[PDB]
Amino acid sequence: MLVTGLEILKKAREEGYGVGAFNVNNMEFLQAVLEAAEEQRSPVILALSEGAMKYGGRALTLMAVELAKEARVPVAVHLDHGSSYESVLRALRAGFTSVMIDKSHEDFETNVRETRRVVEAAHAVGVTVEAELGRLAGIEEHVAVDEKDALLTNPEEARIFMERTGADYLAVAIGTSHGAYKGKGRPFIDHARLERIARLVPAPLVLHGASAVPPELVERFRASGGEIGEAAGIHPEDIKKAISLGIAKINTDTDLRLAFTALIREALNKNPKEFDPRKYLGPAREAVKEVVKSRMELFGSVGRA
Amino acid sequence: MLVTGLEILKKAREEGYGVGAFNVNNMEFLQAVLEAAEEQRSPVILALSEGAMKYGGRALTLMAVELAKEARVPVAVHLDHGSSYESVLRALRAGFTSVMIDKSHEDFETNVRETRRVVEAAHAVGVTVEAELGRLAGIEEKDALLTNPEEARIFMERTGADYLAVAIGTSHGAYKGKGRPFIDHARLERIARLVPAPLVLHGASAVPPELVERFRASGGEIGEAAGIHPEDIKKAISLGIAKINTDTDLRLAFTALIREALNKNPKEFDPRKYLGPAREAVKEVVKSRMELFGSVGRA
Numbered sequence: 001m002l003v004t005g006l007e008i009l010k011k012a013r014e015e016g017y018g019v020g021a022f023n024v025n026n027m028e029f030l031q032a033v034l035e036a037a038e039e040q041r042s043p044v045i046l047a048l049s050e051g052a053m054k055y056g057g058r059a060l061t062l063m064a065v066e067l068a069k070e071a072r073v074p075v076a077v078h079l080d081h082g083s084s085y086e087s088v089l090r091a092l093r094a095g096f097t098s099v100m101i102d103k104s105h106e107d108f109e110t111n112v113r114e115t116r117r118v119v120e121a122a123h124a125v126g127v128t129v130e131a132e133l134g135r136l137a138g139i140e141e142h143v144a145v146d147e148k149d150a151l152l153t154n155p156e157e158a159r160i161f162m163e164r165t166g167a168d169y170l171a172v173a174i175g176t177s178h179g180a181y182k183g184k185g186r187p188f189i190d191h192a193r194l195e196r197i198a199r200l201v202p203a204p205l206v207l208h209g210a211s212a213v214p215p216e217l218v219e220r221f222r223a224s225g226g227e228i229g230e231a232a233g234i235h236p237e238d239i240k241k242a243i244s245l246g247i248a249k250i251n252t253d254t255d256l257r258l259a260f261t262a263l264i265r266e267a268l269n270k271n272p273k274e275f276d277p278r279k280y281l282g283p284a285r286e287a288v289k290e291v292v293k294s295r296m297e298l299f300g301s302v303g304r305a
Numbered sequence: 306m307l308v309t310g311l312e313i314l315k316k317a318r319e320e321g322y323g324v325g326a327f328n329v330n331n332m333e334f335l336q337a338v339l340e341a342a343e344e345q346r347s348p349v350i351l352a353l354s355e356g357a358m359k360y361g362g363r364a365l366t367l368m369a370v371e372l373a374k375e376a377r378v379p380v381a382v383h384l385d386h387g388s389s390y391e392s393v394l395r396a397l398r399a400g401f402t403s404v405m406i407d408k409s410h411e412d413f414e415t416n417v418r419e420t421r422r423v424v425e426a427a428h429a430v431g432v433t434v435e436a437e438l439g440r441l442a443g444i445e446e447k448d449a450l451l452t453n454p455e456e457a458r459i460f461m462e463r464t465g466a467d468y469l470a471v472a473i474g475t476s477h478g479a480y481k482g483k484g485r486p487f488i489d490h491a492r493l494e495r496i497a498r499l500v501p502a503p504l505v506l507h508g509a510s511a512v513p514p515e516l517v518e519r520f521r522a523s524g525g526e527i528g529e530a531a532g533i534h535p536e537d538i539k540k541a542i543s544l545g546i547a548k549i550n551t552d553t554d555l556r557l558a559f560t561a562l563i564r565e566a567l568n569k570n571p572k573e574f575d576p577r578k579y580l581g582p583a584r585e586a587v588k589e590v591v592k593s594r595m596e597l598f599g600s601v602g603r604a
């Protein structure tokens with residue numbers, strides 16, 4: 001059934017497990033995610049980016065919200081990385097139960113202002129919100145004692161931010177190639193920093209830009225004729241510990257796209273006479289479902305429904 | 306707006322134009338068809354076979370029915386080639402407004418009895434129905450099983466069906482006939498003279514040479530494919546055909562675009578990038594088909 005992002009994330013952090021926020025853009029992806037959730041008897045968050053809102057439109061938001069209601073596990077429909085107030089209004093209009101406004105690339109003061117306005121609007125309609133701080137602001141004049149300490153989230157500032165915005169959950173910069181830290185060092189997790197943040201912020205925490213990108217998956221993609229860089233993803237064990245420390249929401253997208261694309265390639269490379277979409281989109285949908293089920297297993301949400 | 310298949314088809318036959326029944330199996334196919342209809346300000350029929358039902362499930366039927374209600378043109382959600390009474394009950398359950406009970410492979414009395422049972426159930430819930438008399442098969446080689454005018458009249462009177470699929474030369478697939486497939490327009494006129502209900506044409510995709518060419522060029526493999534000639538469709542419509550089914554044409558277009566995309570961009574794994582243009586090609590095919598059927602500005 002359909003519930004707020006907070007109902008799901010609060011329980012998750014309380015009970016020490018993670019919930020995957022899986023990005024979907026069409027029917028097959030949405031089906032894959034919900035079936036995985038049902039088979040794993042696990043709560044799940046359906047994530048729709050603005051790219052998804054544009055590509056999928058009313059058809060996608062109709063499915064996400066109505067199918068979420070019919071699910072036998074708790075489901076939340078979440079706007080992934082909203083870039084404007086209007087984008088959030090559109091998500092509220094479409095029945096979303098969780099919204100995220102990303103103004104972390106803005107100065108602390110503007111980020112606060114922008115976020116607070118989204119919070120006020122979302123709360124007026126019973127929707128919870130995810131805000132994002134991903135760089136030392138210097139608010140309490142903290143000095144970056146290191147290059148990384150500069151582009152990553154400061155515990156004290158996070159506490160202030162959440163106190164000021166009233167956001168429900170927070171995405172923090174802790175090492176994953178995302179935001180200011182992007183393209184600036186090897187993908188990792190600053191567990192020490194995560195613990196400090198979690199100590200000052202009891203709200204569930206969110207982890208962005210952290211796909212497993214396992215070797216077998218990349219291998220299959222390359223084998224199917226795909227080309228990709230030396231993709232590096234957070235190590236399974238780190239995700240496991242990050243969750244034990246307070247991360248309740250884990251964004252997942254890349255791994256699904258790769259699996260989906262890999263099988264379509266395999267199907268078309270092997271069956272050149274095939275022009276019935278279902279024959280090649282079907283197994284791709286299945287491959288996606290498998291990735292999702294594995295993520296839920298790794299995150300520890302199996303049977304948490 | 307969501308309406309019955311008959312509300313759309315009766316008007317079409319009355320006014321001399323054809324409305325397309327386009328088969329869809331997922332979100333992008335459904336979006337393509339509906340956007341084409343809105344841009345052409347044309348009525349349209351969303352066709353979902355039992356296969357589409359199995360593949361798309363609740364997500365597909367949810368989209369078809371609900372989006373039809375929001376469309377600014379008349380739309381009907383049609384069960385294509387229903388094979389049983391219970392398949393029809395599931396379509397009725399899923400909110401369809403049109404259903405086809407297909408038993409043309411059974412003898413006359415059996416086709417009549419089963420079609421009649423479907424009619425009673427569908428009509429009890431305001432749903433109109435399509436039935437099929439005759440067996441679709443190639444002509445040029447009267448026919449062992451084409452639709453008989455008098456039997457057609459008898460069939461519709463006894464079943465109470467709302468529209469009838471007629472066998473006058475077409476067949477499903479990309480391989481209609483050696484060269485231009487022959488359409489018995491004489492036979493169609495006779496049927497139309499005795500059967501006033503709107504008539505339905507199956508396996509009517511064009512399978513244009515350039516589309517086949519574009520498919521092959523992307524690595525696809527297909528033999529000597531041939532569809533029904535545009536001129537035959539135009540005339541068939543003027544003679545009584547109000548519902549023209551199109552499926553193969555959409556599938557070839559979609560697959561061709563996906564192939565070119567993955568061929569040209571091996572580093573692309575964002576599905577919207579190769580699925581999106583394929584959806585665009587489907588939409589274009591639907592729009593040109595509506596042009597051909599004469600349904601533009603008919604909404």
Ligand SMILES: [Co+2]
Nearest residue numbers: 132171178208
């Ligand atoms: Co982010």
Ligand SMILES: [Co+2]
Nearest residue numbers: 441477507508
């Ligand atoms: Co047929």
Ligand SMILES: [Co+2]
Nearest residue numbers: 477507508550
């Ligand atoms: Co047919």
Ligand code: NA
Nearest residue numbers: 080081100130
């Ligand atoms: Na997010």
Ligand code: NA
Nearest residue numbers: 385386405435
């Ligand atoms: Na039909």
Ligand SMILES: [Y+3]
Nearest residue numbers: 407409410437
């Ligand atoms: Y048949």
